């Protein structure tokens, strides 16, 4: 009867090392709904998939899983994943050339948040917790992808890394403005959480796992510590079970 | 071979839900290949019967069969999928699943799924023009070609099965619409083939089975292609026979069982020890 949740395998203390942003959106959402589930770890995306035996359904992709959970369990747990709100945010470095319903303001936010965080993800490389079974192959994918010639080329350090942290800070400065509409609480809607906060929280989990501790301490504290406080507020939905 | 390091949680096998009494109506041919292969290897597993995601109104990313790594072509649907926790593996194609089971559990159960053999069979109605998903390099290339040709030979007679197809009632209408599209007809009742057209289709089916039966004459010491030694190539045929067994009238199934000196009835009978629905 419990839900089966398919996540990406990382280095053996998997409860503390798992860090793929899209499966973390679904984990946060399932905990938000307080549904019973167990995690199946798969080695190397296609990979947020759940099986819900309550409806004999197999659902892939994190956004569609979140729509499915809201439609199937509208009132479970903390309640509504998609409360009405205006998510007035565009990542202006999307551009208009490199190719690509329901809750379209959330679907758009998800696309813009993913684009904004993914462009800073060369910062996570030195700390990525490879599953040693998939390590050589995963390093190769990361290489084909950052457009470097080999794995040693990702060594970005010293001055060049500060410039990367700086650009990460500017991106987060523009995103922080959305958290100033309602400062009665740490979320976008103040004290009420939504799937839009979980989207950001999932990316914050990746950074917490993969960044040097001193660098996470800055990220946590930038822009009046808005993301640090969002992170702390989402801990209650962050159980790895 | 990479055997697993432990002995862990059981394999999860995702199969296509058919009409309520599911242990007796399940009939999808590609999932039956995987079931026969798991039973051949004698592995523990449980089945999750799910509605077919390919036809489901639920939006998601599981709508097309994955690419095949070790052979040309693809399965018809997403749904032969296994999760093997012993190796953190999620495998979504009947032929890749059988290759996986042979590399991971090479001596378990009845033993080798891919003993060397020539499988000299061509379905002559393939033609030469239809585009095909192509693998970079195939494992067990005689078996990879046999899999493609056996699917084509049986799938072209599958209008014989529509009247008896055991629809899960929750998905009957969406499944019927997909069959109507894949069959090139305008509506569900266009599939009605009765009396004279059904007999011609049965003669065609018998002609096809007659060419395939020649391969079972090369070793008469037993009912399998290699006589007393079974292989994944027998399971491919046994899987398609199970579809036929569920969806044909019993009286037409007995024709299939007894034609060509009962070669396919003997194979069916010899595969029953691997046919448990668990």
UniProtKB/TrEMBL annotation, chain A:
Which superkingdom does the taxonomy of this entry point to? Eukaryota
UniProt entry keywords in alphabetical sequence: Transferase
Residue ranges of domain Glutathione S-transferase UstS-like C-terminal in the record: 153-237
Q: Which GO terms describe its molecular function?
A: transferase activity
Q: Which residues form the GST N-terminal domain?
A: 20-71
The record's annotation in SUPFAM superfamilies points to:
GST C-terminal domain-like, Thioredoxin-like
Know the name of this protein?
Glutathione S-transferase
State the organism of origin: Colletotrichum tofieldiae
TrEMBL record, chain B:
Q: Name one Pfam family in it.
A: GST_C_7
Q: Name one GO molecular function term.
A: transferase activity
* TM spans (from-to): none
What keywords would UniProt list here? Answer: Transferase
What region holds the Glutathione S-transferase UstS-like C-terminal domain? 190-274
* Top-level taxonomic group: Eukaryota
Ranges in coiled-coil conformation: none
Keyword Transferase in record: yes
- Please indicate if the UniProt record lists Acetylation as a keyword: no
Annotated GST N-terminal domain ranges read 28-103
Q: What is this protein called?
A: Glutathione S-transferase
The source organism is Colletotrichum tofieldiae
